[PDB]
Homo-oligomer: A and B are copies of this chain.
């Protein structure tokens, strides 16, 4: 993958959360996520995908991943997806927007989904 080495490793967002990811040659993303906020403790599995052959015109690298907020410690009955792009270079970043859906009754489904934005850096 063009940015396999750029993406693989440890990232931190503006909340102080930790994203540990391995990028595969094929486009796979596998790792763990630890949230600094919310009803979450320790690491959660993540999986996702990235564009392993991005444009060479200075565009970012599209990618996304999911965490279901169940691990051996806690189950928040919810899942977050991040959708964004990796930008390489001196100050490498992953710029994302996210959707956090909680399981709800049908009556409460209108209030099931939070939306936000996270920026991940290497420091």
Chain A interface (Cβ within 8 Å of chain B)? 15, 26-29, 37-38, 45-55, 57-70, 75, 77-85, 87, 95-107, 109-117
Contact = CB atoms under 8 A, between A and B. Distances in A.
B66 A64 contact: yes
B66 A81 contact: yes
A46 B49 contact: yes
A18 B96 CA distance: 24
Contacts of A85: 101-104, 109, 112
A69 B15 CA distance: 28
A48 B51 CA distance: 16
A101 B80 contact: no
Contact of A77 (B54, B65, B81, B113): B54
A64 B45 CA distance: 13
Contact of A81 (B27, B82, B110): B82
A53 B69 CA distance: 11
A58 B114 contact: no
Given A53-B70, A62-B77, A65-B66, A111 B48 contact: no
Contacts of A100: 83
Nearest to A75: B53
